[PDB]
Scaffold this active site. Sequence first.
Site, short mmCIF file in Angstrom:
data_model
loop_
_atom_site.label_atom_id
_atom_site.label_comp_id
_atom_site.label_asym_id
_atom_site.label_seq_id
_atom_site.Cartn_x
_atom_site.Cartn_y
_atom_site.Cartn_z
N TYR A 2 80.28 74.19 -37.48
CA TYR A 2 80.51 73.93 -36.00
C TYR A 2 79.55 73.30 -35.28
O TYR A 2 79.63 72.18 -34.35
CB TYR A 2 81.03 75.12 -35.54
CG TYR A 2 81.75 74.92 -34.24
CD1 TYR A 2 82.98 74.43 -34.12
CD2 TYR A 2 81.06 74.79 -32.90
CE1 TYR A 2 83.59 74.16 -33.11
CE2 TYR A 2 81.70 74.53 -31.77
CZ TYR A 2 82.99 74.07 -31.81
OH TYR A 2 83.61 73.81 -30.58
N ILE A 34 76.45 74.64 -24.30
CA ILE A 34 76.79 75.00 -25.65
C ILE A 34 77.51 76.08 -25.79
O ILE A 34 77.11 77.24 -25.63
CB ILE A 34 75.33 75.06 -26.70
CG1 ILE A 34 74.99 73.54 -26.67
CG2 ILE A 34 75.82 75.68 -28.02
CD1 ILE A 34 73.80 73.65 -27.84
N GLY A 35 78.90 75.83 -26.14
CA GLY A 35 79.84 76.90 -25.87
C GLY A 35 79.82 78.11 -26.96
O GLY A 35 79.84 79.23 -26.65
N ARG A 40 87.21 66.33 -36.13
CA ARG A 40 85.96 66.89 -36.77
C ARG A 40 86.14 67.21 -38.10
O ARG A 40 86.42 68.50 -38.62
CB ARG A 40 85.43 68.08 -35.84
CG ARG A 40 85.09 67.62 -34.53
CD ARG A 40 84.66 68.89 -33.45
NE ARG A 40 84.22 69.85 -33.90
CZ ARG A 40 82.80 69.81 -34.09
NH1 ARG A 40 81.86 68.55 -33.80
NH2 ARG A 40 82.18 70.80 -34.75
N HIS A 100 78.57 63.66 -25.19
CA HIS A 100 79.09 65.06 -26.01
C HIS A 100 78.50 65.02 -27.34
O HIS A 100 78.93 65.90 -28.18
CB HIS A 100 80.59 65.19 -26.13
CG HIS A 100 80.80 66.75 -25.53
ND1 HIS A 100 81.52 67.13 -24.78
CD2 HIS A 100 80.96 67.79 -26.46
CE1 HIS A 100 81.71 68.29 -24.76
NE2 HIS A 100 81.71 68.80 -25.82
N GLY A 106 71.50 62.88 -28.14
CA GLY A 106 70.55 62.25 -28.82
C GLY A 106 69.25 62.90 -28.70
O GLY A 106 68.11 62.26 -29.84
N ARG A 142 71.31 70.23 -29.60
CA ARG A 142 71.42 70.65 -30.93
C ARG A 142 69.93 71.16 -31.08
O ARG A 142 69.84 72.23 -31.88
CB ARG A 142 71.47 69.29 -31.89
CG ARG A 142 72.20 69.51 -33.14
CD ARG A 142 73.61 69.64 -32.55
NE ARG A 142 74.11 68.48 -31.88
CZ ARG A 142 75.30 67.64 -32.52
NH1 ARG A 142 76.00 68.02 -33.28
NH2 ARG A 142 75.61 66.50 -32.09
C1 LIG Z 1 77.44 73.67 -30.88
C2 LIG Z 1 77.53 72.61 -29.52
C3 LIG Z 1 78.34 73.11 -28.77
C4 LIG Z 1 78.82 72.41 -27.60
N1 LIG Z 1 79.03 73.13 -26.70
C5 LIG Z 1 79.68 72.28 -25.26
C6 LIG Z 1 80.22 73.15 -24.24
O1 LIG Z 1 80.76 74.19 -24.19
N2 LIG Z 1 80.24 72.22 -23.07
C7 LIG Z 1 79.95 71.12 -22.99
O2 LIG Z 1 80.02 70.66 -21.85
N3 LIG Z 1 79.25 70.45 -23.82
C8 LIG Z 1 79.08 70.86 -25.18
N4 LIG Z 1 78.12 70.66 -26.01
C9 LIG Z 1 77.54 69.22 -25.73
C10 LIG Z 1 76.14 69.30 -24.98
O3 LIG Z 1 76.33 69.99 -23.94
C11 LIG Z 1 75.44 68.06 -25.13
O4 LIG Z 1 76.35 67.10 -24.65
C12 LIG Z 1 75.12 67.69 -26.65
O5 LIG Z 1 74.94 68.51 -27.47
C13 LIG Z 1 74.03 66.40 -26.77
O6 LIG Z 1 74.19 65.85 -27.93
P1 LIG Z 1 72.85 66.28 -29.12
O7 LIG Z 1 73.10 67.74 -29.40
O8 LIG Z 1 73.32 65.57 -30.43
O9 LIG Z 1 71.73 65.81 -28.43
C14 LIG Z 1 78.05 71.22 -27.38
C15 LIG Z 1 77.19 70.77 -28.23
C16 LIG Z 1 76.67 71.53 -29.25
C17 LIG Z 1 76.01 71.22 -30.41
#
Ligand SMILES: Cc1cc2nc3c(=O)[nH]c(=O)nc-3n(C[C@H](O)[C@H](O)[C@H](O)COP(=O)(O)O)c2cc1C
Lengths: 394, 394, 394, 394
Positions: B45, B99-100, B188, B291, B323, B345
């Site tokens: 996930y 990150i949910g 996904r 995202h 990124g 991440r």
């Molecule tokens: C496991 C995971 C869960 C995510 N959960 C959400 C969330 O609940 N709300 C949201 O707005 N973005 C979600 N994000 C996106 C992050 O807020 C952010 O946009 C994104 O991780 C940036 O990309 P990167 O991890 O590749 O740098 C999620 C990202 C990850 C990795």
Amino acid sequence: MSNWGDYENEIYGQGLVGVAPTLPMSYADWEAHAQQALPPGVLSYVAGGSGDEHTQRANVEAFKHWGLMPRMLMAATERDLSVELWGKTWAAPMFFAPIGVIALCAQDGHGDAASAQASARTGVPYITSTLAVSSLEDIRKHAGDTPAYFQLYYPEDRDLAESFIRRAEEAGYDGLVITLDTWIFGWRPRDLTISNFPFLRGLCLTNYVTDPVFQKKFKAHSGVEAEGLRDNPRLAADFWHGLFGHSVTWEDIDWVRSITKMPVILKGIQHPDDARRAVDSGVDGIYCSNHGGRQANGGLPALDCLPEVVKASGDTPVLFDSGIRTGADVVKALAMGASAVGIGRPYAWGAALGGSKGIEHVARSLLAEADLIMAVDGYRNLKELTIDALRPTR
Amino acid sequence: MSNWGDYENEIYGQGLVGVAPTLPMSYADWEAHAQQALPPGVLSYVAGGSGDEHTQRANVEAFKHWGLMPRMLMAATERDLSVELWGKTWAAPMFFAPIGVIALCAQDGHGDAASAQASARTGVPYITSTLAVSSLEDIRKHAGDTPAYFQLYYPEDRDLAESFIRRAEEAGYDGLVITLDTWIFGWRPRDLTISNFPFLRGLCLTNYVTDPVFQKKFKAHSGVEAEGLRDNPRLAADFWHGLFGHSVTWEDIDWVRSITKMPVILKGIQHPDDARRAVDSGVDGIYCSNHGGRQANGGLPALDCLPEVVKASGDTPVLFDSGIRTGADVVKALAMGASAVGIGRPYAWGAALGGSKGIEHVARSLLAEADLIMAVDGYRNLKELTIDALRPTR
Amino acid sequence: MSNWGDYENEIYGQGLVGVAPTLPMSYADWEAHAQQALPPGVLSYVAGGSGDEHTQRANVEAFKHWGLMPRMLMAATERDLSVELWGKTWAAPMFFAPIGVIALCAQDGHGDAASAQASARTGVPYITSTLAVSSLEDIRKHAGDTPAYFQLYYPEDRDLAESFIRRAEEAGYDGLVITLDTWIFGWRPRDLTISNFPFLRGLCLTNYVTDPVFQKKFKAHSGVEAEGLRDNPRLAADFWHGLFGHSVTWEDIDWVRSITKMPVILKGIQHPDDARRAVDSGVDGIYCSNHGGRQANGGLPALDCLPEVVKASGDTPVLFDSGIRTGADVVKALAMGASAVGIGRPYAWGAALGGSKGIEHVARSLLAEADLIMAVDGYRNLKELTIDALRPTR
Amino acid sequence: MSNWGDYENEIYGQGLVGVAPTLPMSYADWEAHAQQALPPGVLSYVAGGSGDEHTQRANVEAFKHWGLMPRMLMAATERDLSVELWGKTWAAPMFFAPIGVIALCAQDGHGDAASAQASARTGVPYITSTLAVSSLEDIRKHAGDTPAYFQLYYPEDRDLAESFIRRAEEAGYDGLVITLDTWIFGWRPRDLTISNFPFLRGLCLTNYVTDPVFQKKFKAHSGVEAEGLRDNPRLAADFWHGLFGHSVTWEDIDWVRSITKMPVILKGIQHPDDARRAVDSGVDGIYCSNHGGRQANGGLPALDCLPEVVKASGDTPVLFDSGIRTGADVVKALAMGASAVGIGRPYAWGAALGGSKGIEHVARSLLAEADLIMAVDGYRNLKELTIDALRPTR
Ligand SMILES: Cc1cc2nc3c(=O)[nH]c(=O)nc-3n(C[C@H](O)[C@H](O)[C@H](O)COP(=O)(O)O)c2cc1C
Ligand SMILES: Cc1cc2nc3c(=O)[nH]c(=O)nc-3n(C[C@H](O)[C@H](O)[C@H](O)COP(=O)(O)O)c2cc1C
Ligand SMILES: Cc1cc2nc3c(=O)[nH]c(=O)nc-3n(C[C@H](O)[C@H](O)[C@H](O)COP(=O)(O)O)c2cc1C
Ligand SMILES: Cc1cc2nc3c(=O)[nH]c(=O)nc-3n(C[C@H](O)[C@H](O)[C@H](O)COP(=O)(O)O)c2cc1C
């Protein structure tokens, strides 16, 4: 010289009588074997760069994106690779770049001496780091007849900085290189993973331990006299660390210049207006470097900055390092307008596999290749190697 | 702050007394070790993105194609990395992105709490997802004195959406981030291969399970009262799924703004005319994101869109994520004009290896590197980090 | 808990409603993941054995050269794996072997308490090392109703030894295990390569710093009172190293039997004469072990020694560890006449991945496998599983 | 030096103050690194054995099929590993086996002197090959107080043989080792594939070119006087090859015993009748060896031959080499009745990585491991470590 390329005649000649080479002939083999031959802390320190090392790697990749245009029927049968820098004649447009732990790249612990001696026998100038096991006076003796330069890490104590510069002028160094990109250490994951910082264990602090100002000020601070310190440099590692890294200013450079007759050469310059202001202020040399990407991982290959640094520098000599791995690289940087080209990482591997002779083999291999490239491709001397000889390549 | 780069002194200092690091120092090592430390569903996930993940990967690659130009003799010996956003002073231009499932990235199941506590100790703001194990009220307490933001996944029930916004304002959140790119889940493959969708197992629905509107409407729908639901959230997973994802409209944003005093910040904006219309409509912040490429694999790196989003945004603050892997990345996005930079991440891996302390280590590592890059390369504060400091690189 | 094998029906029942496992199901995947989830110092210390680790490996290999004979039409539909040890009823013929750094195998740094908590929930007894983070008094508390054992590292100080023994008795431990094969540390290349040794950093010394004798003697030796020792146990690490390792003698065993009512169990016995002589001393238990090959690389698999140690010990119970990786290994060692079998490395990996619940999962998996083999292959209880049910195998 | 095992406390004491090891700690890592630190010609020659090297490998494997029985409650807290050999007291039951190219395993090309210097510091006796870079007179000088042995390659010239023996006696060597399994070189594919053979290049012939008999005979055969031979030993290489290999006979042993007072030790014995017959000749020592599988790929592990060679030799001491890689191997061969054990390949890797200090480290590591095993497993001295403490193992 005679010609530097002649070196391959000797290798081939020895094979004909059943005498195989004992050292590698290419960077990749130098690196592959050296890295396994070194202690793990030294490997982490010498191989490792800043952050994810994109910059250290981009420095090297940059060279794959220029090509030399071959000129036929030029008959470049006698090459002149000499350069005159600040009054001295260099037999080769190449020099050993400063490496503060080169002492420890060699199994016997005296890789710096070994480097200076290789300089003495080849005529490739040695630039000694401020950090070292041999004192800067012993280094200059080991360097023989060959021009030698002193690289200052400018400390947070004007008295000490002036002691280093005075001692260097008195030892007969031929110029002074002030490193501008290392008053504080960049984020280095390979060293951080193992919390490897050798100077804080009192290693390579001979130039401080032997300096009269440092000795006096450390005794004032600790009670320890000059003998106890020399027998345990680590006693003053914390004191060293507090004074090691002064962030150099424009006004500092004007001060340094006014207290020594050595030419002043600034290392770390990447930006042409920084080169412009230096040169317009009377600085004697510009040394385009980003410190191998070891100190900041901002992403800009050194070689990308050298052309505009050359233009802004005018007739002021420009030195270049950061990413040179082969003689091809050396020719390309010279063609872009560097007057002389610094060699880093390759000669540290030289030291790990063969000491002074290994270092000498790297230097002579690099110059043989450069000289043979100039011969085959029809450039008879460095004045004929101009930037219009190069072509950008995908 | 003092300076963020000071953090490396502590790592090196501990090694000198025989205390080695226990966590990794670089993203690649964070990822390599975290991914093996996590349960397989969580790995799929958190690591997994949309389609063949070209976008997720291109987001990261983009950063290799800008370089910071080093400035010598700037003496940037005291850095100011603070930013003022919507009235509050941030100690660092960096924040934990939403990150949910961060709750589940930590072995104890409370990675979200752990993230908020790391925010409290570092001053790196936490943006809590709407999806979570700790309720948004408990999160804000865990965040201490540090600014905290609430990221709304806007549901298909105006009463619920307003309950979330009201509760967030009452809990003392400092702004409201509306995520525009996730009203429906993108294709996904890693999750589909194993039919892994954790929220439908009733995980991370605390904010719904505790909400009065959701409780009332789910009981109306199911007969289940607030206690039974809280003891088995999965009873309402199907109900959650039906209302989870409202496709947000321009008119919705005007409605949200009129019912709360929190600043409104829109996340997912890539197109400058979308940024133009938002800002001209009085939206308070623009959060350039795609995202992580987790939701659509269209191919456009987030970072490619940030410059034109900055220009169209004017003096309206722009947040950036998608990124960022290292402190180098953080400096480059700031230089392009982002006011603050979101981390995704990397801190999920922090959580997998060390909980709250692992998260804190990622944040402090990223900021130490950024601050040391600014020092070595001569940028003393974020106002001096301008887009002309960067250079495109092959 | 009707039979240990029922655990599998939980794992399969959960998948039917789309709840996937979160922890691995075999030793191979525990070792693989766990070793990547651990700080490199804990990894080196836990995984590493003595010398080139032949003995560590050969201990495990030996289980591949015995096969259990399946017996059909026995209807072992109810199994009794209980064992009565020194007047207490063990729910399982299995126990957690002493591990002095188990606290550090868990991210929260209290893996020793988590092990005791898993024992309190499983019925699998815990054997606490003398080395620990939680006091031996709190470990016993955390172990609930489950019989608990104290493993003594006999120190070079009879007063301190006696206070340890009296403490364990008073804390209500049910046996005193005396480890005989670690009064001096063996050659361990993995730890030596990085000079890794957590005790000398004052880690896991709580049972010494909570001890009134250690306090007194350490205060006489250094001037530091108990509170400052409680807050910097490393102040005492060199003093700990000076008295840690006493080479236990026959007369010492005699002296220990006389100052406690606890059953005395000698760990490290491999030779039958050493066991026979112990049993004639009136020693209460024989703990056949070579410490997982961690102290001495002499090459003799511990399992090769069990049959003859069982025979020399007559009526006295024999515990066995060193090489147990699965429930098949458990069955085989019981079949050779071990009354109870110890787990080491597998539950350390459990801690590194799930803490208390990870430990519990390893233990319930091992016992589920062991029970299911007995069920399938026709052994209704431990009295029927004898050495005559085994066959040597290529 | 109280016990060899104390070496480990140095390595751990240094890490506590942040001084990491610089050399590897196990044979595997010595071999791996060392083989990459060596010129390819030295690598091929040192690592390569005879044929497909089955015998070379099987020599090593044989140690995996014996295990030492640990004995508890023996309190071997003081160990006596000394051995008395031909009226001299060895501090260690271990010696450096003869290696004719050891000089070339060290970067400075004097690995033979460095080996003697490590023996002078460790007490581990050095056995110099007839093949060497330093004269046998200077090797003895470099060996200080440590007993030193001269290994004779009996030449096809009794005069030259006798002058070698008289020289070694006069230089004060304490024994004459006669190698019996290299009067002709075996099929060595690694060297043949690249036609590698350093002696024919005049390398390592100093003991011949310093010899008055060799000089005279070579001058009659070529007209070249001693100085020109000293400066181009290769002038003599084909002449050396013509008289190098004399197939020693029983009567030759008789003739050697009568012209020296040195104890005579025969190296290469594998068969019990050959030993029994030697001992009845009045030979002083039996040196059980198959030259590490380097001369003949017949397939018999040297260790399979030791027990019966010990029994056939009665009171005469038996030395053993071929396959020793760790201190566990040392213990096992002593246990089978070797009075002293020789190290070959491990110390060559030592030279390639640390020179004298690398050699010393291998030797002190091997002896630290051996001692610690005896300590842990209950053998206080070499008289207690007998063949009855071993068990054959799968
Ligand atoms: C496991 C995971 C869960 C995510 N959960 C959400 C969330 O609940 N709300 C949201 O707005 N973005 C979600 N994000 C996106 C992050 O807020 C952010 O946009 C994104 O991780 C940036 O990309 P990167 O991890 O590749 O740098 C999620 C990202 C990850 C990795
Ligand atoms: C191990 C190592 C140590 C360094 N030591 C110093 C030093 O003491 N002084 C200095 O000015 N530069 C330092 N240099 C940088 C070199 O002088 C040169 O800038 C750089 O190595 C060129 O990069 P490259 O090796 O990737 O080609 C160091 C470089 C290396 C590899
Ligand atoms: C990391 C570790 C630490 C150890 N510490 C202890 C200890 O404090 N006391 C003790 O008697 N044995 C200790 N040993 C030995 C174990 O109690 C047990 O005998 C051993 O782990 C069994 O071998 P295996 O783990 O290879 O199956 C330890 C084992 C491991 C893996
Ligand atoms: C590179 C090398 C050269 C050898 N040269 C000699 C020599 O000059 N004289 C001799 O008697 N044996 C020599 N041998 C055999 C060794 O003395 C010893 O018997 C052998 O190395 C033991 O086998 P191992 O190295 O596989 O343990 C040599 C061994 C090696 C590895």
